[PDB]
């Protein structure tokens, strides 16, 4: 009759080590690669 929408970890180890530049660090690695050279 009606639909509402309402608002309602070890996996981090599998990705904080395999790496895919997933954090704020990137915002900085990019800036350094853009400026420091």
């Amino acid at each position: 009759l009606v639909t509402f929408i309402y608002e309602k970890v070890e996996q981090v180890l599998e990705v904080r080590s395999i790496d895919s530049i997933s954090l704020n660090l990137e915002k900085r690695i990019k800036g350094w690669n853009r400026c420091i050279t």
Binding site: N24, R28, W32
Partner: protein
Amino acid sequence: DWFPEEPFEAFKEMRERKVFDVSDMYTIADVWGWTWEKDFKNK
């Protein structure tokens, strides 16, 4: 903790944390005394 986004402040952190400082910034022309090389490289 993060190093500053601004490169110069990041260098100031490099000094303060002693991760890199000017005393490590040395090369052969400054080390084996090749004082002549100043006259060759840039011309």
